[PDB]
Design a binder for these strands. Structure first.
Ligand SMILES: Cc1cn([C@H]2C[C@H](O)[C@@H](COP(=O)(O)NP(=O)(O)OP(=O)(O)O)O2)c(=O)[nH]c1=O
Ligand SMILES: [Mg+2]
Ligand code: NA
Ligand code: NA
Length: 327
DNA sequence: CCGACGTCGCATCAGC
DNA sequence: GCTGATGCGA
DNA sequence: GTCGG
């Protein structure tokens, strides 16, 4: 209901989560802290003790103790300590560069590379993805206003149709959900000559065209069905430049399109809650298909899908439009 | 006591 | 050269 | 770290 009811606590758990993933390299702890952060931020009361919070599904003893220390002292001792730790905080920060995960960050800090400057002084030791992530460190953390998302959509749909009028391109993500701003642009791509049953360079032709009109500027990774890169809007004649933005383009078989749209429309936390319920109801869902689970709990053949609501029907959930799919 | 905790595509690395 | 494992991001 | 077999 409101971030400031227990925001001091949720910040704490979120901070603790990051250090688990990035420094301890313990992903399941990281999730446990965020799972607890989620359920507490939805708690419509100001928490007065660890024991009270422990009633919430996801909060156990160890987190309850920490809330007590926080409520009493207004801080965490393990957190004040790890914040000032040069090794730990450097590793944690370095992972904010796209391409640098917990492993690489630990490897960089170990040979003394602790900052963005140290990184820029050492371009040789970075791979392609990491260099680009370093180059656009600031831009990749900026949000994209909906107005710009719309202009970027204009260029995408236009140039996609120019390569082949039978391409189907849909911008998904938070944009499709109607958010006033997005973190990146998610593009789903579809062509009549590409299905599960079965032209060579369908994804490439779209990418290179977007490169030619000088929209796509860099490539993080590119395979046959999935592209990851950087793009930028053209600025007014003498006006200043737009930030470089992240854009993913994904070629999905046309007969699996709606499972793709649903999956990449999100939201991430919604898309998770859905498939979790689906599994509890006898189905399994991924980016391509929805398959019924057997009596020994094994998946069968992919069911037919001709709309997003079909997948909703299968798992006994009433339809939610993209704008209502945040959680 | 201790195992589960989501999954996909691509770059890169370990190893034959 | 090749297959398979691991790191990574969404 | 938490839940649950
Ligand atoms: C972050 C994330 C995303 N995904 C998938 C499912 C999401 O529905 C889909 C969208 O990803 P996104 O771009 O991180 N989510 P968004 O576009 O809704 O929010 P934003 O404005 O781009 O940050 O990517 C995962 O499967 N695991 C993840 O950890
Ligand atoms: Mg997105
Ligand atoms: Na509990
Ligand atoms: Na990163």
């Amino acid at each position: 209901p409101q971030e400031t009811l227990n925001g001091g606590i949720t910040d704490m758990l979120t901070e603790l989560a990051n250090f688990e993933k990035n420094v301890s390299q313990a992903i399941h702890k990281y999730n446990a802290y965020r799972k607890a952060a989620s359920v507490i931020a939805k708690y419509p009361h100001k928490i007065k003790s660890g024991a009270e919070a422990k009633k919430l599904p996801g909060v156990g003893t160890k987190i309850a103790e920490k809330i007590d220390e926080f409520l009493a002292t207004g801080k965490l001792r393990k957190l004040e300590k790890i914040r000032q730790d040069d090794t730990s905080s450097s590793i944690n920060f370095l992972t904010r560069v796209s391409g640098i995960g917990p492993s690489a960050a630990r490897k960089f800090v170990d040979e003394g590379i602790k900052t963005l400057e140290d990184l820029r002084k050492n371009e040789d030791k970075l791979n392609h993805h990491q260099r680009i992530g370093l180059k656009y460190f600031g831009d990749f953390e900026k949000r994209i206003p909906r107005e710009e998302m719309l202009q970027m959509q204009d260029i995408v749909l236009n140039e996609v149709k120019k390569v082949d009028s039978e391409y189907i391109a849909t911008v998904c993500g938070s944009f499709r959900r109607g958010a006033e701003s997005s973190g990146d642009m998610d593009v789903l791509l579809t062509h009549p000559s590409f299905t599960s049953e079965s032209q060579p360079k369908l994804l490439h032709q779209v990418v290179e065209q977007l490169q030619k009109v000088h929209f796509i500027t860099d490539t993080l990774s590119k395979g046959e069905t999935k592209f990851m890169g950087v793009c930028q809007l053209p600025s007014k004649n003498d006006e200043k430049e737009y930030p470089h933005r992240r854009i993913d383009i994904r070629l999905i078989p046309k007969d699996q399109y709606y499972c793709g749209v649903l999956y990449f429309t999100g939201s991430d936390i919604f898309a998770k809650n859905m498939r979790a319920h689906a599994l509890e109801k006898g189905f399994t869902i991924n980016e391509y298909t929805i398959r019924p689970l057997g009596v020994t709990g094994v998946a069968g053949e992919p069911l037919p899908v001709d709309s997003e609501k079909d997948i909703f029907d299968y798992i006994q959930w009433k339809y939610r439009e993209p704008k209502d799919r945040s959680e």
